[PDB]
Amino acid sequence: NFQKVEKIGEGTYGVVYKARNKLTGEVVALKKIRLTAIREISLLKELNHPNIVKLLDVIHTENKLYLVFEFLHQDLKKFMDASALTGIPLPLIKSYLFQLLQGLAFCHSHRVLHRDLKPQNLLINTEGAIKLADFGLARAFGVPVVVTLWYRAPEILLGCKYYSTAVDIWSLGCIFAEMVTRRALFPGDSEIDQLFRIFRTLGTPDEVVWPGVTSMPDYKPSFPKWARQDFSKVVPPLDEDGRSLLSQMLHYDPNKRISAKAALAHPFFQDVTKPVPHLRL
Numbered sequence: 001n002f003q004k005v006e007k008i009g010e011g012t013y014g015v016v017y018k019a020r021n022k023l024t025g026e027v028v029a030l031k032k033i034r035l036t037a038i039r040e041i042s043l044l045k046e047l048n049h050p051n052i053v054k055l056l057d058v059i060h061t062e063n064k065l066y067l068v069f070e071f072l073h074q075d076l077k078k079f080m081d082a083s084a085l086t087g088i089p090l091p092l093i094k095s096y097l098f099q100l101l102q103g104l105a106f107c108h109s110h111r112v113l114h115r116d117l118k119p120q121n122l123l124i125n126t127e128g129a130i131k132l133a134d135f136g137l138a139r140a141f142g143v144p145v146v147v148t149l150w151y152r153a154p155e156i157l158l159g160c161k162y163y164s165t166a167v168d169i170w171s172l173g174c175i176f177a178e179m180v181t182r183r184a185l186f187p188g189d190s191e192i193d194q195l196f197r198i199f200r201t202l203g204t205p206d207e208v209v210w211p212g213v214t215s216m217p218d219y220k221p222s223f224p225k226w227a228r229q230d231f232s233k234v235v236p237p238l239d240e241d242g243r244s245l246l247s248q249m250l251h252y253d254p255n256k257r258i259s260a261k262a263a264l265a266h267p268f269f270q271d272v273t274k275p276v277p278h279l280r281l
């Protein structure tokens with residue numbers, strides 16, 4: 001049905017190809033996934049937002065699951081690498097953050113979580129748009145399907161079984177910091193190394209800042225107690241509006257962590273514009 005054009009990427013869920021519909025000529029991103037889900041997934045075809053990748057078609061044939069997505073040429077990881085020596089201009093960082101919060105507020109309003117946000121899942125086009133892609137919906141929908149931990153919320157790493165929309169805010173805060181500084185904020189290589197990198201920067205959490213943290217499934221009283229280091233070291237250049245918003249995105253307590261909807265009203269976005277990136281395809 002399709003002419004494979006190139007392999008776009010991997011991820012231990014499946015493989016993604018750029019492909020051309022043999023009959024219509026549409027170029028699409030084709031996701032092959034080896035194996036109540038089929039129904040609720042398919043609902044997403046008609047649930048759409050400018051800052052979410054469009055799921056064109058869902059095809060369950062054989063012992064595999066094919067997902068046909070709209071194709072975009074670039075992602076934020078590639079753009080950030082290409083911008084490492086210059087840095088992404090603040091107005092574009094701001095526009096991207098704003099759009100991603102719009103995308104999250106939409107899918108959170110429909111009670112859909114992403115769960116696995118990372119730069120390489122954020123697609124961008126020549127028109128200044130950025131879109132949520134590669135949702136981690138396998139577990140949530142119950143599909144019978146090396147992992148990056150750098151953007152995982154602390155409640156996930158501490159074994160919370162029933163985590164909330166707040167996990168996506170945490171991940172987006174880590175990406176925000178990375179656009180600003182051009183370095184991953186918390187590049188852990190194990191679940192405990194990820195946790196300890198977070199603690200070394202934001203302080204070991206306790207019941208004062210995060211009620212109930214000490215009762216969490218993987219919390220150990222033996223965790224080292226790091227002081228919180230001053231937040232001025234975290235994303236240095238960024239102005240106080242940006243730092244303020246980031247600090248609310250990185251609150252330990254998911255109940256205190258800012259929502260996508262409230263973050264859209266933060267003063268950091270008072271002068272928000274939509275610049276156009278300069279993309280080499």
Ligand SMILES: O=C(O)c1cc(OC(F)(F)F)ccc1NCCc1c[nH]c2ccccc12
Pocket residue numbers: 031033037041044045047048052053054055065067107110112133134135136137138139141143
């Ligand atoms: O992005 C993927 O890879 C993916 C995998 C899925 O199930 C799995 F089993 F994992 F394959 C299911 C959906 C997926 N994307 C959904 C994108 C989407 C369109 N409209 C939406 C409205 C609100 C929230 C999200 C969306």
